[PDB]
Amino acid sequence: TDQQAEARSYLSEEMIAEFKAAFDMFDADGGGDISVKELGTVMRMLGQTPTKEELDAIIEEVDEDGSGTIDFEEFLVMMVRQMKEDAKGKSEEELAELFRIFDRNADGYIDAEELAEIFRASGEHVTDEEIESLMKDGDKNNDGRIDFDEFLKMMEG
Ligand SMILES: [Ca+2]
Ligand SMILES: [Ca+2]
Ligand SMILES: [Ca+2]
Ligand SMILES: [Ca+2]
Ligand SMILES: [Ca+2]
Ligand SMILES: [Ca+2]
Ligand SMILES: [Ca+2]
């Protein structure tokens, strides 16, 4: 429940209303909570084949009142945990892909020449001062190269 108030804070009124419409769809008998059987129906329609224990595990994750079912507030907690997981996955994909694009010769690090080339190719004029500054900040051991960990660190924020 303080967790439920916390979940609601990550969302706008409109997002909560969309989740409410989804919640009601899943709640096949319209009683106010999603059961293991109701969860299973939606999962099977999504192509999954969870076992009864796996369905039970999913509900238990957020079942704060021990009802063995997911009410709307618990559902919001589940949705927010998932949105957070998805956001983190999207960021990791973007970071890896960005590195993949900058490291043109695939030697494991980005050097000044590669930085400059990707910006130019992207249609952006970047000054030498700017490249210098980027290298100063990203390159922590000062060897003129930004390896994957430095890149991650320099991308934080
Ligand atoms: Ca129900
Ligand atoms: Ca519950
Ligand atoms: Ca390289
Ligand atoms: Ca080089
Ligand atoms: Ca510009
Ligand atoms: Ca510029
Ligand atoms: Ca370095």
Side-chain angles (χ1 to χ4, degrees):
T1 321
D2 78 295
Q3 179 178 231
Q4 288 167 182
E6 187 179 328
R8 279 177 170 269
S9 79
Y10 183 87
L11 310 168
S12 66
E13 259 177 44
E14 294 90 357
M15 291 168 180
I16 294 170
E18 282 199 45
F19 283 135
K20 180 57 174 146
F23 174 81
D24 292 346
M25 303 201 293
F26 301 159
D27 177 14
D29 71 5
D33 60 20
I34 297 170
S35 67
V36 172
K37 170 175 67 43
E38 287 171 344
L39 178 62
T41 303
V42 298
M43 294 192 70
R44 286 183 329 261
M45 286 170 37
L46 293 169
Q48 329 257 56
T49 48
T51 60
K52 183 173 165 220
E53 184 271 334
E54 284 165 345
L55 287 168
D56 192 45
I58 292 162
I59 293 177
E60 295 200 344
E61 281 264 285
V62 299
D63 187 23
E64 75 75 36
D65 65 353
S67 81
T69 59
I70 311 170
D71 65 42
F72 188 52
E73 304 301 314
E74 299 170 330
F75 182 72
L76 290 178
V77 168
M78 183 180 62
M79 290 299 102
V80 170
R81 292 192 185 159
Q82 190 62 46
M83 291 170 72
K84 285 192 208 166
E85 182 39 59
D86 299 331
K88 176 179 183 287
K90 290 212 179 316
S91 140
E92 293 169 355
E93 285 157 16
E94 292 164 35
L95 261 357
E97 179 61 12
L98 256 192
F99 189 84
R100 178 168 178 87
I101 288 160
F102 272 120
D103 183 12
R104 288 326 299 147
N105 68 354
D107 65 5
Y109 58 85
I110 301 170
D111 55 34
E113 176 174 22
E114 283 170 329
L115 281 182
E117 180 51 19
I118 278 70
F119 299 128
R120 187 210 62 72
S122 88
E124 178 58 35
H125 175 251
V126 181
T127 67
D128 292 352
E129 281 303 322
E130 284 167 290
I131 297 304
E132 236 200 295
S133 180
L134 289 169
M135 292 298 316
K136 162 181 199 88
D137 181 75
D139 175 23
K140 302 304 190 181
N141 63 334
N142 304 297
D143 64 353
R145 303 168 168 172
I146 299 174
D147 63 15
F148 195 60
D149 297 304
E150 292 171 310
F151 179 73
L152 292 187
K153 282 160 186 160
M154 102 176 268
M155 289 305 289
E156 286 178 12

